[PDB]
């Protein structure tokens, strides 16, 4: 998968998320450029939209650290990418909403979905 085919995927992924959730276009950009309000339920619906759409969480939001490590392995090396699923697989939280926040905010301290862009 190309920088510039992951580019367009995350653009189309971005809109049809948007488009479920019914998010403002303001706090979808909000997490695009990594700033992740963990606690706004649209904001949780999106992230876990997002998630879901790489097949990242399954459809009852079970965890697939694997399918973080084929999109970042895109990104930044392959040591980071070991440190970064270390890092946000076991994020302390029961309730899945806030787990697909905090999930989303974890992975964009390493690269932002907007920093994509720019590759």
């Known amino acids: 998968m190309t920088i510039e085919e992951l580019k367009t995927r995350l653009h189309t992924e971005q809109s049809v998320?948007?488009?479920?959730?019914?998010?403002?276009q303001q706090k979808a950009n909000d997490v695009i450029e990594g700033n992740?309000?963990?606690?706004?339920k649209k904001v949780q619906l999106y992230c876990e939209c997002i998630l879901k759409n790489f097949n990242i969480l399954d459809?009852?939001?079970v965890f697939k650290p694997q399918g973080i490590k084929a999109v970042?392995?895109?990104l930044i090396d392959e040591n980071s990418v070991k440190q970064l699923?270390?890092?946000?697989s076991t994020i302390s939280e029961e309730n899945p909403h806030l787990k697909a926040?905090?999930?989303v905010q974890c992975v964009s301290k390493y690269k932002t979905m907007?920093?994509?862009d720019f590759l």
């Open 101 to 103: 926040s905090k999930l």
């Open 17 to 24: 998320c948007k488009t479920e959730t019914g998010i403002d």
């Open 59 to 61: 459809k009852n939001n």
């Open 72 to 74: 970042m392995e895109l």
């Open 114 to 116: 907007k920093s994509v």
């Open 85 to 88: 699923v270390s890092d946000c």
């Open 36 to 40: 992740i309000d963990v606690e706004d």
